[PDB]
């Protein structure tokens, strides 16, 4: 599944009712007003964050003029396709050599349940007692990507030798909110001048995702050398999704 | 490393020549070298036959021109063109004598909503110094104008003065930034050039010779 | 004239009227040749004040009505079928002995130009297509089937000036091998150019209802022509 | 943020005959401010937000032509918008072109009066939320677009 | 003591057509992205130069004549390094049949003639035949020597007979194209021609409009003084006065017999400067109407001045005459009840 192309985004109309699942193009290029809809707020925050990152690498405005303008007016589908073109081969959940936020070829004695990506459902000795079971039985492609991202960002790391994210463990995330999900996502994207004022991109600084150019074991990374793409989508752990089962219901 | 003088060319209408012996008087999209030399040469009190002062000025000075786009009330305003059907009645028939045509006609092009920021500097073989130029731009002796005498300025000719290695880098300190730049001096990153016929051949009145700009896109 | 020195200089000359007639067409190898069967062969000459890119198809593309580029260029087409083209083109536009306009250009084309002529002709005819769309529409505004004012030529000027930025760039930098999408884009930008110019032109008169009628009709014919330009 | 048009429409349709009667007596949009029933009608629809007042005043005023003078009809699934005001006015076969002429050239206030007369006379069938947006802005551009739609419709039909 | 005088004028014209092109359509220009009606630099300047006011106060000035006799000494040692005094005195005597400065176009043309006289001396050409060869040029320059002020102010006539390069005389006054402060709604007149012998029709159209125009001009005092033979600043200021008056009253003549837009300007501001500047950017963002276009235009002018004057370095005496009583301008700009008072103010260098 590919985050830029396929339908993964769980939404319901700003005003409306029945939930449906859209693709990024439908979000960026439509005056339809959307709001996220999952049964958990932390996962909605994970989602929103993911979308914001995505938009931050595909389409930063070139000035405040354009910024305001694009908030007020959706893109044309062609503009979009042109914007996402160079990035598509980086956002495949299941891929041959570069799986999204995963690491190919992981050595593990046993399979970790899906629940361990769902922050809070288990992890403490009183969880089996107070929580409903089965929530990590089988997850959507979306619920999964979103969980993956949340685990490498705002959630605490698994423990022993599982490094936490770039902002430290359990950071607070603060976003500006808009009328719809669209304008929200756009509203938390740094314009090109602010973006390069905050990150001057060198030949010295690696700007490739972690799942394309891997972190070397026990490397000592100068924080300065990490590029905004590499860091926004930083993945500090060695995770690799097992082969998917068939049709059914996101638990 | 090198000192630069920074001028601003802006007004309602602007006219910068192209080759013509006909009545159509064309305009290009940004100031000509002959034009800029003429402007400076005009602030300085340089009569037309003073071939010495002309030459002095020409071999002394070099230009790099940046095209500023207009933003109004936060909407972008492209530069547009204008054609003026311009007649003359009582025009001379010969270069000698007093016989005249009843009416002759010329078409003259102008640039609308055009604004430029120019950076000039001295060459190795200079006969002049920058503060002569600055002093003139601040207190010109002849009336200055953007191309034709019917195009005033809406902004002072003098913008500022600074120093750097590039003309580019010098231009970076004056907004708006992001415009295309045409420099007589090469800039390492950029290979594109723009053919022109700007150079005035002082030895030969009112004739011009080919040259090339270095193009630094924004 | 030169500004250079020379031992001998000429100060005048002698001419007198002389007449003859050369029946037929001499195959001069420096100029393209337009062919029209009503048969009529005639060498290319600047006729209007339009931009140079409107003549490009007659300069680089063979077509057997049809067209015949200069021998020089097709020799070069055979000899170096893997080389780009940098072509000098020039001439006058005249009213008897009077020079109205002088033209000189150095067109550029990457490799594919020898074989993919049809693409070049496509581009040019697309440009002229949009031009005639705008012109037809504003003519409609002017006359009817009337506003009282002709605005179409001025608008054609504006159009042409912006086309100067658009089309040549395409011809000089396009990959003919696969060129559909660059062309598509050109079509779009031209489309919105015609919309913008139409509105800008009729804008000062649309405060009066009677003009808004004819304006609406004109706009109709405009979008008819514009939509027909989408394959 | 944006004004609900369909809600207001249905509200106007189900209004009690007395209130409707009370509103139908204005002869000018601002007179709606003299009328209790009006404020009761538009209170749910954001009257209390100054941004929406002028807009609402126009909407109601046009609706105040009659309880079912403006027949709403949904657009077809295929096309992007429904029937425009001009088009409907033209479709009625009861509206003369000069009426629209003098409409788009009228001063403020007067235009709305004239418009309401045209609506009573035509009983148009149209996409109401569309007309509502139009009334929300109602400037040169919109007046012009009205006359254009009228002209082109009358031309083909 | 600044070199440049700036003149800004706001004038409103009732429905008319003061300037059109080859297609009989009013002249055009885009400014600030919006279209403005234009009156050309040419049209307006001609309006001035061919006026009766110009004729009486420029074409009939005292400084209008250049006496060659009084220019002997200065001429000769400005030309001594190119010509012998014989050839010079002969030439000057030919032209004519105490002073220490001389207008450059004079020096240039005199030089050309001198050259010709020497040229004719070398071939021992008869004097009678010499004059017979250059009768025309003599007449020409004899004319131009009678129109000193005119040439100093406006420049050479389009048919002048000037031969040299110093003969390419620029006007001391530079006149801009006039554009409207606002976007214009143009009108179209539909007329017919009644045939009194068959009144039983074929319509023609003329475009026309009304508008508030911003006229701008500047005067290069130094250049004026120089091209009058070194005349004083007071005199140049006199001339300047006349030019102000004209820019405030003179109106092109086009179609005025049938549209009669005979309007005087409603605002006239004069402003001294080292660098001449147009205030056209006051109207870059086009004026929107509010009880007319005139008041808002004037207001936009004043407030532009307030906003940018000092920053753009327009530090120099400045006065404003205006009929409309809108919100006044900076305390430093002196108000004037009458044009004549503004004129007098200019005449005495601005105090």
């Amino acid at each position: 599944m590919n985050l830029l192309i396929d339908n993964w985004i769980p939404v319901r109309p700003r005003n409306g009712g029945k939930v449906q699942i859209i693709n990024l193009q439908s979000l960026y290029c439509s005056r339809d007003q959307w709001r996220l809809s999952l049964p958990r707020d932390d996962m909605e925050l994970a989602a929103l964050a993911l979308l914001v990152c995505i938009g931050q690498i595909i389409a930063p405005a070139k000035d405040d003029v354009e910024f305001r303008h694009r908030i007020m007016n959706p893109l044309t589908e062609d503009e979009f396709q042109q914007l996402i073109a160079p990035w598509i081969d980086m956002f495949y959940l299941n891929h041959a050599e570069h799986p999204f936020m995963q690491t190919k070829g992981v050595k593990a004695n046993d399979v970790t349940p899906m629940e361990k990506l769902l922050a809070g459902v288990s992890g403490a000795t009183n969880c089996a007692f107070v929580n409903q079971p089965g929530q990590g039985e089988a997850l959507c492609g979306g619920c999964t990507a979103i969980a993956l991202f949340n685990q490498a960002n705002q959630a605490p790391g698994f423990g022993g030798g599982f490094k936490s994210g770039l902002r430290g463990g359990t950071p607070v995330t603060t976003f500006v909110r808009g009328i719809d999900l669209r304008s929200t996502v756009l509203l938390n994207v740094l314009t090109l001048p602010r973006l390069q004022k905050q990150f001057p991109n060198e030949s010295h600084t690696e700007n490739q995702p972690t799942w394309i150019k891997p972190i070397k074991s026990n490397e000592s990374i100068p924080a300065s050398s990490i590029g905004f793409v590499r860091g926004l989508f930083w993945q500090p752990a060695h995770i690799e999704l097992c082969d998917p089962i068939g049709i059914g219901k996101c638990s | 490393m090198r000192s630069y003088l920074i001028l601003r060319l802006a007004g309602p209408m602007q006219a910068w020549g192209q080759p013509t012996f006909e009545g159509t008087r064309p305009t290009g999209r940004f100031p000509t070298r002959s034009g800029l030399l003429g402007l400076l040469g005009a602030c300085l009190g340089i009569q037309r036959d003073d071939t010495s002062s002309l030459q002095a000025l020409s071999e002394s000075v070099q230009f790099a021109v940046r095209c500023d786009e207009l933003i109004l009330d936060d909407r972008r305003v492209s530069v547009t063109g204008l054609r003026d059907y311009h007649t003359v009645l009582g025009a001379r028939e010969d270069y000698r004598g007093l016989k005249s045509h009843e009416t002759i006609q010329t078409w003259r092009e102008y640039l609308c909503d055009a604004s430029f920021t120019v950076a000039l500097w001295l060459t190795p073989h200079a006969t002049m110094v920058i503060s002569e130029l600055e002093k003139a731009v601040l207190k010109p002796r002849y009336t200055p104008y953007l191309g034709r005498r019917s195009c005033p300025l809406t902004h002072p000719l003098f913008l500022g003065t600074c120093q750097a290695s590039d003309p580019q880098k010098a231009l970076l300190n004056y907004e708006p930034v992001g415009g295309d730049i045409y420099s007589e001096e090469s800039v390492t990153g950029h290979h594109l050039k723009f053919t022109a016929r700007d150079e005035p051949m002082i030895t030969l009145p009112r004739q011009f010779a080919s040259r090339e700009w270095y193009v630094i896109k924004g | 004239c030169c500004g250079q020195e020379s031992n001998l200089r000429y100060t005048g000359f002698l001419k007198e009227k002389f007449t003859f007639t050369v029946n037929g067409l001499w195959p001069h190898p420096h100029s393209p040749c337009l062919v029209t069967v009503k048969v009529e062969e005639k060498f290319l000459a600047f006729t209007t004040s339009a931009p140079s890119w409107t003549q490009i198809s007659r300069v680089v593309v063979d077509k057997i009505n049809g067209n015949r580029v200069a021998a020089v260029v097709n020799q070069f087409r055979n000899i170096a079928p893997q080389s780009p083209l940098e072509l000098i083109m020039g001439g006058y536009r005249n009213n008897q002995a009077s020079i109205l306009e002088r033209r000189h250009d150095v067109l550029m084309f990457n490799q594919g130009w020898q074989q993919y002529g049809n693409v070049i002709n496509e581009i040019v005819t697309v440009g002229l297509g949009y031009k005639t769309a705008l012109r037809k529409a504003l003519y409609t505004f002017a006359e009817g089937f009337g506003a009282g004012v002709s605005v179409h030529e001025t608008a054609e000027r504006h159009f042409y000036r912006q086309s100067e930025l658009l089309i040549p760039d395409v011809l000089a930098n396009v990959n003919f091998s696969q060129a559909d999408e660059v062309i598509a884009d050109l079509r779009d930008k031209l489309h919105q150019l015609c919309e913008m110019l139409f509105n800008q032109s009729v804008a000062p008169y649309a405060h009066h209802p009677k003009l808004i009628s004819t304006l609406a009709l004109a706009r109709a014919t405009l979008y008819k022509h514009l939509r027909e330009l989408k394959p | 943020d944006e004004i609900d048009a369909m809600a207001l429409y249905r509200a106007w349709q189900q209004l009690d005959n007395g209130s409707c009667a009370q509103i139908r007596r204005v002869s000018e949009p601002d007179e709606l401010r003299d009328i209790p029933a009006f404020y009761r009608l538009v209170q749910p629809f954001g009257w209390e937000n100054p941004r929406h007042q002028q807009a609402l005043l126009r909407m109601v005023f046009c609706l105040s032509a009659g309880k079912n003078v403006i027949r709403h009809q949904d657009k077809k699934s295929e096309q992007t918008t429904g029937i425009s005001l001009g088009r409907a006015l033209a479709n009625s076969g009861r509206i003369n072109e000069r009426r629209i002429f003098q409409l788009i050239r009228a001063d403020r206030t007067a235009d709305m009066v004239q418009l309401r007369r045209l609506l009573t006379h035509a009983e148009p069938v149209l996409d109401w939320p569309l007309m509502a947006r139009m009334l929300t802005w109602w400037g040169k551009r919109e007046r012009q677009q009205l006359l254009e739609d009228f002209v082109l419709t009358t031309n083909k039909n | 003591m600044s070199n440049f005088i700036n003149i800004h004028v706001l004038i409103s014209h009732s429905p008319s057509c003061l300037n059109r092109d080859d297609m009989n359509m009013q002249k055009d220009a885009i400014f600030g992205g919006k279209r403005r009606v234009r009156i050309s630099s040419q049209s307006l300047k001609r309006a001035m130069r061919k006026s009766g006011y110009y004729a009486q106060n420029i074409g009939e000035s005292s400084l209008r004549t250049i006496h060659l006799a009084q220019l002997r000494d200065v001429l000769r040692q400005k030309l001594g390094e190119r010509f012998d005094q014989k050839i010079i005195d002969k030439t000057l005597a030919l032209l004519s049949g105490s002073a220490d400065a001389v207008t450059p176009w004079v020096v240039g043309e005199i030089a050309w003639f001198c050259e010709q006289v020497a040229k004719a001396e070398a071939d021992n050409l008869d004097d009678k035949k010499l004059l017979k060869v250059l009768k025309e040029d003599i007449a020409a320059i004899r004319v131009n020597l009678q129109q000193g002020v005119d040439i100093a102010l406006s420049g050479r006539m389009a048919t002048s007979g000037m031969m040299t390069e110093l003969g390419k005389v620029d006007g001391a006054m530079s006149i801009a194209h006039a554009i409207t402060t606002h976007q214009v709604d143009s009108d179209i007149d539909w007329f017919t021609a009644v045939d009194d012998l068959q009144e039983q029709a074929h319509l023609g159209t003329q475009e026309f409009s009304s508008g508030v125009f911003y006229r701008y001009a500047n005067i290069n005092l130094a250049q004026l003084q120089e091209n009058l033979g070194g005349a004083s600043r007071e005199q140049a200021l006199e001339i300047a006065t006349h030019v102000v008056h004209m820019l405030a009253t003179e109106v092109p003549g086009a179609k005025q017999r049938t549209y009669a837009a005979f309007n005087p300007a409603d605002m006239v501001m004069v402003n001294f400067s080292d660098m001449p500047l147009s205030m056209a950017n006051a109207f870059e963002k086009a004026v929107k109407a509010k009880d007319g276009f005139l008041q808002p235009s004037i207001q936009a002018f004043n407030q532009y001045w307030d906003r940018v004057a000092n920053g753009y370095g327009l530090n120099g005496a400045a006065a404003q005459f205006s009929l409309s009583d809108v919100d006044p301008i900076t305390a430093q700009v002196k108000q004037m009840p009458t044009l004549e008072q503004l004129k007098s103010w200019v005449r005495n260098n601005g105090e």
Side-chain angles (χ1 to χ4, degrees), chain E residues 254-266:
Chain E
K255 265 180 190 326
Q256 292 283 87
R257 232 155 299 293
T258 50
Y259 281 87
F262 298 106
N263 317 108
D266 289 84

Side-chain angles (χ1 to χ4, degrees), chain C residues 146-151 153-154 158 200 203-205 207 210-211, chain E residues 23 25 28 30 33 35 183-188 190 205-207:
Chain C
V149 287
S150 62
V151 304
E153 282 163 11
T154 319
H158 280 116
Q200 188 191 259
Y205 307 113
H207 55 93
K210 116 176 125 174
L211 285 180
Chain E
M23 305 277 271
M25 294 213 59
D28 221 20
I30 291 177
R35 168 192 176 269
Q183 202 175 358
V184 176
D185 283 321
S186 267
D187 289 289
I188 305 168
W190 285 77
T205 54
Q206 177 61 68
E207 180 193 47

